[PDB]
């Protein structure tokens, strides 16, 4: 039921600090999401969207964030890259659907929407459904940084450009991940 303020929300969170909505004990329809042509894709892993309408689940979690077009392929079980390693990794036994639609009208500004960020540097990979929001000055070299951001001392959060006039592979794409338990 609280799906309305999850898809039609005004602003979404960055991929490094994605959100999650506790969906439970609510009349849920999954045929409206497939009939609504307001999306760009709808891929389900393990579960079928045809039977999803008549199924009683324990709890449902909806994860929302924003990435790029060429980064959507990384919201899938068993994929690498900047995402699915440092930002949002899915388990290989994932039983759910991954909704993703273009949002160049909202999440991209003409001067440059530097408000959306992604984690570029990290020491260890993210476990499935892990959310790291630290601002540790990443140390890649042999000189320990410890607060200072000099050479080989980078702030791990880089921001997306998000300019409307570029291609679709470089445009912001709003993603909503449906997990069923």
């Amino acid at each position, epitope marked *: 039921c609280p799906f309305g303020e999850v898809f039609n929300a005004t602003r979404f969170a960055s991929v490094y600090a994605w959100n999650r909505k506790r969906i439970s004990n609510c009349v849920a329809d999954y045929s409206v999401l497939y009939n609504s042509a307001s999306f*760009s*894709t709808f891929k389900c892993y393990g579960v079928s969207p045809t039977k999803l309408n008549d199924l009683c689940f324990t709890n449902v979690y909806a994860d929302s964030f924003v990435i790029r077009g060429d980064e*959507v*392929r990384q919201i899938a079980p068993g994929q690498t890259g900047k995402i699915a390693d440092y930002n949002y990794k899915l388990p290989d036994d994932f039983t759910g659907c991954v909704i993703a639609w273009n949002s160049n009208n909202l999440d991209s500004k003409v001067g440059g929407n530097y408000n959306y960020l992604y984690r570029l540097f990290r020491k260890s990979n993210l476990k499935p459904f892990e959310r790291d929001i630290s601002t540790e000055i990443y140390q890649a070299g042999s000189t320990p940084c410890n607060g200072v951001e000099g050479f080989n001392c980078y702030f791990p959060l880089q921001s997306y450009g998000f300019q409307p006039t570029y*291609g*679709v592979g470089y445009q912001p794409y709003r993603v909503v991940v449906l997990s069923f338990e």
Partner: antibody
Amino acid sequence: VQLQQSGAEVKKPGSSVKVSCKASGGTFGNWSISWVRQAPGQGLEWMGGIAPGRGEATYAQKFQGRVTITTDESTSTAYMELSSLRSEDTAVYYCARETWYTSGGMDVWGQGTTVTVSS
Amino acid sequence: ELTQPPSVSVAPGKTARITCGGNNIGRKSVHWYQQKPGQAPVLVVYDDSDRPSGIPERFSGSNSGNTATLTISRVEAGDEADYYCQVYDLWSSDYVFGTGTKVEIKR
């Protein structure tokens, strides 16, 4: 806004060729250009793409590791370099503007440059 | 990966229909390019059924899950060209084209 490509080339097999794609309207602006080739009498094939304003280029998995797509904004000309030319790499090579209002397409299409790759 | 029939032959005045079959193609993104002998491809249909400025309303698109079709209404003698369908596969980050369909005008 119109794209102009380089002239046809005849490179011996196993060599490397550089293909230029200049935008007529001064600078490329904040657009992104993709490269598409077409073998003689065959279909269209996507090789890669580049956003000259952000310095980041992505290549198709089939051509990943063989092509090099770079630009320079002193002249605002996109370049595509194909190494290890083979007899099947003969094609008409296009550069096209990636759309921003179509959720995945190609807007303006360059005239096309034709390499032969023959001994 | 977007398979098209090798060629379709429609009689003048009739409607040409060119199917484009793939796996899990976008609910809002199938593009159609007309290419005549020795010319660059021209985008005639985008976003499944939409048309750019200057493309006649004769061209029409349609999509039903895993198969898109191009509709050329009232085909005349100036419609002989190769037509390719193209989408942006979000799950592969690649622009994928079609095998191409040759349109012959009956006579």
